[PDB]
Amino acid sequence: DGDLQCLCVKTTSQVRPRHITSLEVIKAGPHCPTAQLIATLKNGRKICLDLQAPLYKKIIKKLLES
Amino acid sequence: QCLCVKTTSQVRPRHITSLEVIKAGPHCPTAQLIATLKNGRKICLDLQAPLYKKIIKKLLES
Amino acid sequence: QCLCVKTTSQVRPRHITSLEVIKAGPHCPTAQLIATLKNGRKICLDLQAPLYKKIIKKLLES
Amino acid sequence: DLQCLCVKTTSQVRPRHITSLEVIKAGPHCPTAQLIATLKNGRKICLDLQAPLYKKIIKKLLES
């Protein structure tokens, strides 16, 4: 067992893409058995998203085409 | 005044451990793609190159 | 090929939430200082000792 | 939504094996700061903020 655990202890499906200033996609590894989608909000609040194509492939658009 | 001035596509997807997508803002006209390699090394990816497209898919666990 | 081409000192240590110190390597002749502000923005910092020292002491103390 | 990345720290590490160090400020995610070092192979470990070791690794990292 390593020093690290998943940063995401829970997730949220309640988010309007416009509120997000940053999205980090972290691949699974020794630190976490699952992938993680960490979104940062305008205000500096960070949340984790569930891995469904909707939200993310959508949020990525709002950020990638801005 | 972006952090990602000089980009690259000279990256082996299998070496990317994470990808941060940053929205264009007051200090950068365009969105930025910052990838981290296992080495810990951080590089910027080309928003116009097709690489990051399949890169993000690999991290999602193929 | 460094990620940090142009660096800056125009930052408020009070708004930095994380600092990534990257060792100089085969792809970058010098160390690289990457700070993350609360709003998510990322910037490269000048290597000026007094700067990162003031920044690390603050992050490592809240 | 977030918690501490570090659940424990290691002390048996060669300062010259560290290619990267991440200094994370305490906040809602973790009530304590954290020191995450990546190693030459890509392995990540956390460092004790009490021990003087990390201060050594930092200065050794910045001076190239």
Q: Which CATH class is domain D1-64?
A: mainly beta
Compute the distance between CA of residue D24 and CA of residue D9 in angstroms, rounded to an integer: 14
> Side by side, which strands form the sheet with A36-41?
A46-48, A36-41, A20-26, B16-22, B32-37, B42-44
Using the beta-carbon criterion (under 8 Å), do C17 and A44 form an inter-chain contact? yes
Distance from CA of A11 to the nearest CA of B (A): 16
Task: Check: CB of residue A46 under 8 Å from CB of residue A8.
Answer: no
Numbered residues of the known binding site of B for heparin: 53-59
For chain D, the farthest-separated pair of C-alpha atoms sits apart, in whole angstroms, at: 37
Task: Check: CB of residue B24 under 8 Å from CB of residue B14.
Answer: no
B62 touches chain D (CB under 8 A): no
State both tokens at A60: 């990525």
Compute the distance between CA of residue B6 and CA of residue A52 in angstroms, rounded to an integer: 32
Q: Considering only CB atoms, which chain C residues are within 8 Å of B41?
A: 22, 25, 27
As a whole number of Å, the CA-based R_g of chain C is 11
Cα–Cα distances (Å) from C52 to B46, C22, C58, D4, in that order, read 29, 13, 10, 23
Q: Where are the domains of chain C?
A: 1-62
Q: Considering only CB atoms, which chain C residues are within 8 Å of B20?
A: 42
Compute the distance between CA of residue A3 and CA of residue A18 in angstroms, rounded to an integer: 35
Structural determination approach: X-ray
CA A9 to mean position of chain CA atoms: 12
- B/e letters for D30-57, b = 16+ CB within 10 Å, e = fewer, are beebbbbbbbbebbbbbbebeeebbeeb
Cα–Cα distances (Å) from C46 to A7, A37, A44, C10, in that order, read 29, 30, 24, 9
Compute the distance between CA of residue C47 and CA of residue D48 in angstroms, rounded to an integer: 25
Resolution (A): 2.0
* CATH code of the region A1-66: 2.40.50.40
Task: Check: CB of residue C50 under 8 Å from CB of residue C58.
Answer: no
**Which DSSP category does B46 fall into?**
P
* CATH code of the region C1-62: 2.40.50.40
Scanning the structure block, which residue is given the tokens 């949340």?
A: A47
For chain C, the farthest-separated pair of C-alpha atoms sits apart, in whole angstroms, at: 34
B50 touches chain D (CB under 8 A): no
> Virtual CA dihedral for D7, C40, D59, A7, nearest 10 degrees?
10
Compute the distance between CA of residue B34 and CA of residue B20 in angstroms, rounded to an integer: 5
Distance from CA of B30 to the nearest CA of A (A): 7
Task: Check: CB of residue B21 under 8 Å from CB of residue A26.
Answer: no
Compute the distance between CA of residue A53 and CA of residue B41 in angstroms, rounded to an integer: 28
**φ and ψ at residue B53, rounded to 5 degrees:** -60, -50
Compute the distance between CA of residue B23 and CA of residue C40 in angstroms, rounded to an integer: 9
Q: Considering only CB atoms, which chain D residues are within 8 Å of A48?
A: 1-2
Q: Sign of the C-alpha dihedral, residues C45, A38, D22, B38?
A: negative
Q: DSSP characters for A7-62?
A: SBSS-B----GGGEEEEEEE--BTTBSS-EEEEEETTS-EEEB---HHHHHHHHHH
Compute the distance between CA of residue D55 and CA of residue D53 in angstroms, rounded to an integer: 5
